[PDB]
Symmetry: D2
Amino acid sequence: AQQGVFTLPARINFGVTVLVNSAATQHVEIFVDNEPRAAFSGVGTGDNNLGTKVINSGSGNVRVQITANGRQSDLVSSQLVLANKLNLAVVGSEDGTDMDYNDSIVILNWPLG
Amino acid sequence: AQQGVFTLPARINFGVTVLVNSAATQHVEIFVDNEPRAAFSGVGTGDNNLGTKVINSGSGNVRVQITANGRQSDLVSSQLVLANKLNLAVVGSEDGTDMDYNDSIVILNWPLG
Amino acid sequence: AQQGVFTLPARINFGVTVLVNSAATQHVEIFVDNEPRAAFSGVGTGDNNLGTKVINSGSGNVRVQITANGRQSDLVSSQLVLANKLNLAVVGSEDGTDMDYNDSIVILNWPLG
Amino acid sequence: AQQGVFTLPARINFGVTVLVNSAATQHVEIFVDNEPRAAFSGVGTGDNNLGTKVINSGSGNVRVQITANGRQSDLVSSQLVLANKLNLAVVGSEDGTDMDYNDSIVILNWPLG
Ligand SMILES: CO[C@@H]1O[C@@H](C)[C@@H](O)[C@@H](O)[C@@H]1O
Ligand SMILES: CO[C@@H]1O[C@@H](C)[C@@H](O)[C@@H](O)[C@@H]1O
Ligand SMILES: CO[C@@H]1O[C@@H](C)[C@@H](O)[C@@H](O)[C@@H]1O
Ligand SMILES: CO[C@@H]1O[C@@H](C)[C@@H](O)[C@@H](O)[C@@H]1O
Ligand SMILES: [Ca+2]
Ligand SMILES: [Ca+2]
Ligand SMILES: [Ca+2]
Ligand SMILES: [Ca+2]
Ligand SMILES: [Ca+2]
Ligand SMILES: [Ca+2]
Ligand SMILES: [Ca+2]
Ligand SMILES: [Ca+2]
């Protein structure tokens, strides 16, 4: 199945947070309606927090892509809703051979404020 | 049900990341085996990222506590496992009256590295 | 936080499946727009499957209530989305003192077909 | 990533429940330690419930396999823990071209009783 693809409410601001756990430099790109709208990069094995960016969901079509070593990482993803209100969309990714799926972890959340 | 309490693998390092979305200053404490092991605080309505701290799970008994305006916030939580490997334990919290449950969002993840 | 309350897409058919793990007889009621629309009852400690019923979500406001021993059970719930398409809304419940939260398990899923 | 594979607590009884939503006859096999331990089959587009079977997790290595039209369906999966106690492992599957991932839905839950 496709992974890292989420339908958000239209025209909503959402946060994107990235954590890294790899020796390979990670490159995360967030697409909204197929347009490149947020980028992160970093490296480190101690859950290195690359910060949070807030962007708008456009029509709602959001996609996460992660690269390392010049190639697309393998993705795994899910969406969770807590208290019928708090949404988290989570992506884990694997750049190598150990199947730890923590090399980049991308968290989308909404609503904000 | 109790919320914000998780059983982790014993003696594992895990990351804790906090985002805030409230006018009230948030105070997060992470307990391991009933002892305080990590603190965060901050205020903001823009999904403001308080950083990540790595701590050890001890026997595995981890509890997230969130306080604002001198009162423990109402918590909601769950744990997700992706690819049979990546664990996220998520806590939303409500400090007020709007039931948005985003006032502090606390994310635990393991394994690291 | 309120638990067992979910916002579904409007006017959608969804399935409700109930499993029981208790010596106390369980009574599950599904409300749609505050109206009583599906009922299940049963007992047993071996994950006894009470079947699946398909009902319509109306405006989208769905609530799960569970009783045993004449009183409302304590609920815990979450919603999961897989492949950006398959929705499960899950309720666990506790009728007693052992905090196993399996006494009735209610699963809502959509879309069908 | 591999999907439909879960590590359960060792030697635990768990329930497996299957729902179908397809014109194609579904065949579900649950493997424990690489050995077949439970089968289900059926066909229907109405979230049709194939029942629940209880089996033992052995060493803990559980795999869900879903076949339709003689081909293994594409799987998506995750595990959820509620109240730090109730575990659900969920598998959606796609036998065709519409990407609805509901063709068989397999739900594992533990602990029982
Ligand atoms: C070389 O492998 C990459 O870096 C290592 C330090 C590990 O984080 C591993 O999971 C990752 O895939
Ligand atoms: C006063 O209420 C608090 O601050 C507001 C700006 C909102 O973030 C609200 O959710 C929060 O509970
Ligand atoms: C009397 O307690 C009820 O029945 C027992 C057999 C257990 O299933 C328990 O979890 C449940 O709360
Ligand atoms: C032929 O396609 C199969 O049957 C249809 C009735 C739908 O349930 C579809 O999702 C499924 O893949
Ligand atoms: Ca890796
Ligand atoms: Ca790694
Ligand atoms: Ca609030
Ligand atoms: Ca808020
Ligand atoms: Ca109980
Ligand atoms: Ca029970
Ligand atoms: Ca299909
Ligand atoms: Ca289908």
